[PDB]
Amino acid sequence: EVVTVEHAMGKTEVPANPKRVVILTNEGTEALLELGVKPVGAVKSWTGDPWYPHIKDKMKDVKVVGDEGQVNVETIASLKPDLIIGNKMRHEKVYEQLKAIAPTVFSETLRGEWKDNFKFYAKALNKEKEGQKVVADYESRMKDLKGKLGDKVNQEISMVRFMPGDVRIYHGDTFSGVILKELGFKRPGDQNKDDFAERNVSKERISAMDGDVLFYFTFDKGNEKKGSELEKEYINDPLFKNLNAVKNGKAYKVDDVIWNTAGGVIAANLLLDDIEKRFV
């Protein structure tokens, strides 16, 4: 009937064979799908209507239970789940409300932890063996790519994000950070740090964006397109145009969804594919 799972908010008995699972992160949604569990409810994709294209078909008739930052507890209760999976960084405040509905287990954070989070979700679902195969398959595809890249990994890759009111330079404890590191890519300067990002990068700090290759991506909250507005301002600034990466023709806009925001094992595989497309 049950198994005990240690997690970010304690120790909880969960079904040995969960039948009606609700999943409260985008990255966790991908874990479930790859582990052969279709959730009865899930938070909408950050920039989907409601689902990212890469999971849309797999999410047919899944009930939207809010978004990752603001979950709808009433909708979750209505689904009568036997297991709820969330994340302490996103959902700590609603943990007790979720626990009142069904056994609830939390991962700790997002940042660069996608692979450990995936393994945790596999444990929570009692699908460790299945999870080992998914991880092994990803690592094999990763090894395939390392071979195809050869010494192209010796390039310093710079990661820049435009968001509403905030230009960021992404560092090591991030989705792109840990995957670039696993592949063996170098990073320039502070992008080697094991923190999340340099935040609120000014036009004066544009020099900190340089590298051998510069990948930038943009997040827009809504129809205001405030992220894209900031991108336009920065990439047309003379300081940006004088970056070595830009003068070399090696500054590229990449997809926010697969390079950062989806954040799960399906996206990780799509990121490998995109890197192969761009470098090989």
Side-chain angles (χ1 to χ4, degrees), residues 2-5 7-10 12-48 50-59 61-73 75-79 81-92 94-98 100-122 124-147 149-180 182-185 187-192 195-220 222 227-228 230-232 234-240 242-280:
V2 303
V3 170
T4 300
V5 173
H7 62 98
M9 297 292 291
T12 177
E13 287 189 335
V14 193
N17 184 18
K19 303 255 191 143
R20 298 186 63 77
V21 186
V22 167
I23 182 65
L24 304 178
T25 65
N26 288 185
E27 53 90 40
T29 299
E30 299 186 3
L32 266 62
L33 293 173
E34 283 297 293
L35 294 160
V37 179
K38 186 173 178 181
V40 296
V43 292
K44 72 177 291 295
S45 301
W46 281 119
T47 57
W51 311 121
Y52 296 123
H54 69 277
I55 64 169
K56 177 175 160 164
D57 290 354
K58 293 163 178 181
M59 298 294 286
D61 300 319
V62 176
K63 183 70 185 293
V64 176
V65 298
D67 66 58
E68 184 175 301
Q70 184 173 231
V71 183
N72 191 320
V73 176
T75 306
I76 293 169
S78 79
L79 289 168
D82 61 0
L83 177 63
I84 300 165
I85 299 170
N87 180 263
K88 184 175 176 184
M89 185 266 289
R90 294 292 194 213
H91 309 126
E92 184 179 356
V94 298
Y95 176 75
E96 292 288 320
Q97 293 176 59
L98 299 169
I101 295 165
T104 299
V105 301
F106 276 14
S107 50
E108 177 69 31
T109 193
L110 298 179
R111 303 173 75 87
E113 301 296 326
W114 76 270
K115 199 189 287 186
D116 278 344
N117 286 349
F118 175 82
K119 293 168 177 175
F120 166 72
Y121 303 135
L125 297 165
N126 198 19
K127 297 216 192 184
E128 268 186 36
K129 182 179 71 67
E130 289 87 345
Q132 286 171 339
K133 180 60 163 48
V134 173
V135 171
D137 287 350
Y138 164 83
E139 289 175 350
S140 183
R141 298 190 77 247
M142 193 277 297
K143 179 64 170 302
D144 287 334
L145 182 52
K146 292 204 293 191
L149 289 167
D151 81 345
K152 290 176 174 68
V153 299
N154 291 335
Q155 290 169 286
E156 289 185 346
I157 308 301
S158 179
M159 301 300 314
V160 173
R161 194 185 194 192
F162 300 103
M163 313 181 72
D166 184 9
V167 182
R168 299 181 177 177
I169 300 173
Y170 269 59
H171 293 175
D173 197 8
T174 62
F175 186 77
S176 62
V178 299
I179 293 166
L180 288 171
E182 190 176 15
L183 287 162
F185 279 100
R187 308 291 300 275
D190 288 355
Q191 298 182 49
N192 292 289
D195 64 355
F196 183 72
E198 176 176 344
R199 300 249 260 137
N200 298 106
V201 174
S202 62
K203 281 157 164 287
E204 286 78 4
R205 282 286 292 169
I206 282 171
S207 61
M209 300 180 174
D210 216 347
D212 290 307
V213 179
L214 172 48
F215 291 131
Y216 60 95
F217 53 110
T218 299
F219 183 78
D220 287 314
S228 294
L230 206 49
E231 177 198 319
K232 185 184 179 182
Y234 275 61
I235 74 175
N236 293 296
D237 190 285
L239 295 161
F240 193 93
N242 202 49
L243 292 172
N244 288 323
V246 174
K247 294 189 290 187
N248 271 275
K250 295 178 173 170
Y252 309 95
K253 184 162 183 183
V254 305
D255 174 25
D256 179 88
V257 172
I258 68 170
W259 280 79
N260 187 74
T261 300
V265 63
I266 298 174
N269 278 287
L270 295 176
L271 178 52
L272 296 184
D273 299 347
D274 199 48
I275 291 170
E276 183 174 5
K277 181 175 169 192
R278 290 173 178 283
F279 284 96
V280 184

